[PDB]
Amino acid sequence: MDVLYSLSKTLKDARDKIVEGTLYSNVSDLIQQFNQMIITMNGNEFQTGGIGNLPIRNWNFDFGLLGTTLLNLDANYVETARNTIDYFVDFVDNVCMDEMVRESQRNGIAPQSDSLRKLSGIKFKRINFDNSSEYIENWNLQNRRQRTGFTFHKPNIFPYSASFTLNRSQPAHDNLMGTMWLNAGSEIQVAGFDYSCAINAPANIQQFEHIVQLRRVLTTATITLLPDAERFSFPRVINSADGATTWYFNPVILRPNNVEVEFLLNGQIINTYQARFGTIIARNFDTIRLSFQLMRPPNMTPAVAALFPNAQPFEHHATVGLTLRIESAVCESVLADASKTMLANVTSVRQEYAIPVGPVFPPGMNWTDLITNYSPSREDNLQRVFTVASIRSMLV
């Protein structure tokens, strides 16, 4: 991996720095690294495999060294370098693709394709140089069993789940009490709905709770918390839990009362926020507990007082919402997020060459199914393919 990364980094530096007219002192170290790469690679045969529709490709390296002895790089130099660089970039791209489409249940962190296994030999260690990218740096940390850290903007930590729980219900679904939620991406929308508007509650207060168990720990997470859930604040016809019938939802939104957001780690309270909206920092947690309340308004103008009668039928159901967005966070594991392209790159490569589903990942690299069952073997394979994808994206 570090050798593949160093090949790609050398090629990217060569493409960016070996340009016409440049001073040789700008590229001296790059020229030495490039020549070391050529020397290490010369004489070696590689085969990038025929998994799926990925074509079988054969690679032979017999290249001359890049010249020294120029004060400024000229067009001849750039042309020779470009020929060599183009061939090397094609090879590295094919190696990255061949690695991206493979997986093993056990030892899934180890290289899978033949070319990357060959490149893991001692003889190629000479190629290795500056491992500065986030993914390669975390790869080296993981190899050394050190703390790993990935920074995500809008981490895709929640699998898609649009569900509801009815805490009070009956076959006619006209006096219902419960909660409905959408967890997706970095966003949670939850809403506690009471059809009776807490007329018969002990203090006219209906408590609502929502626990989301993150499948990986997050740290240094900045989170926007907003009082209402726009997703569950308009009239809906919702299937019954067993699918037999449909019930009706006619929300009228009251401001949530006694909002209590707890960020928990291993069943311990780390962060607590009461009646706080806007940005909050959850420094380290694996669970989010939202406790809100519908407090029946003690005073109601006639227009308001009409909507909440003492008894049934209840036509305007009192709903209190909450929206929680994880804007950015840090996780020790690789995750899909809004800004990066690793998951999309891996999925695209798997789809383009018709890679059959393997024994590690869900078909189509479906992220909901992946992160619902984010097993350690899946974590290793995903970190591997994502590091390879990031190495590829440096050149392609």
- Please report, as residue ranges, which positions from 8 to 67 form the binding site for a copy of itself (by CB under 8 A): 13, 15-17, 19-23, 25-26, 28-29, 32-33, 36
Q: Is 169 in the site for a copy of itself (CB under 8 A)?
A: no
CA distance 391 to 113: 15
- Best CA proximity match to 73, nearest among 35, 26, 40, 37: 26
Look up residue 373 and give its DSSP letter. Answer: T
Position among 228, 259, 381, 385 found at the interface with a copy of itself (CB under 8 A): 228
Question: Segment 84-143, which members bind a copy of itself (CB under 8 A)?
Answer: 105-107, 109, 121-122, 125-132, 137, 140, 142-143
Q: Give the three-class secondary structure for 247.
A: strand
Instruction: Calculate the alpha carbon distances from 208 to 79, 222, 255, 291 in Å.
Output: 69, 24, 13, 6
Q: Is 300 in the site for Zn ion (CB under 5 A)?
A: no
Smallest distance, Å, CB 200 to a copy of itself?
19
Q: Is 239 in the site for Zn ion (CB under 5 A)?
A: no
Q: Is 336 in the site for a copy of itself (CB under 8 A)?
A: yes
Site string for Zn ion, 146-185 (x = CB under 5 A): -----------------------x----------------
**Burial of 279 (C-beta count, 10 Å sphere; 0-12/13-18/19+):** exposed
Smallest distance, Å, CB 74 to a copy of itself?
5
Regarding beta strands 187-194 and 317-331, do their DSSP bridges make them parallel or antiparallel, or are they unpaired? antiparallel
Q: Is 166 in the site for a copy of itself (CB under 8 A)?
A: no
CA distance 377 to 396: 28
Cβ-contact 253, 320 below 8 angstroms: yes
Rg over alpha carbons for the chain, rounded to the nearest Å, is: 28
Position among 23, 241, 275, 344 found at the interface with Zn ion (CB under 5 A): 241
Regarding beta strands 317-331 and 251-253, do their DSSP bridges make them parallel or antiparallel, or are they unpaired? parallel
Q: Is 347 in the site for a copy of itself (CB under 8 A)?
A: yes
Smallest distance, Å, CB 276 to a copy of itself?
7
Smallest distance, Å, CB 304 to a copy of itself?
5
Residue with tokens 């042309």: 79
Smallest distance, Å, CB 231 to Zn ion?
19
Out of Zn ion, a copy of itself, none, what residue 83 binds, judged by CB under 5 to 8 A for its kind, is: a copy of itself
Q: Is 269 in the site for Zn ion (CB under 5 A)?
A: no
39: number of Cβ within 10 Å:
14
Torsion (CA) 250, 253, 259, 263 in degrees, nearest 10:
50
Q: Is 344 in the site for a copy of itself (CB under 8 A)?
A: yes
Question: Segment 268-287, which members bind a copy of itself (CB under 8 A)?
Answer: 271, 276-281, 283-284, 286
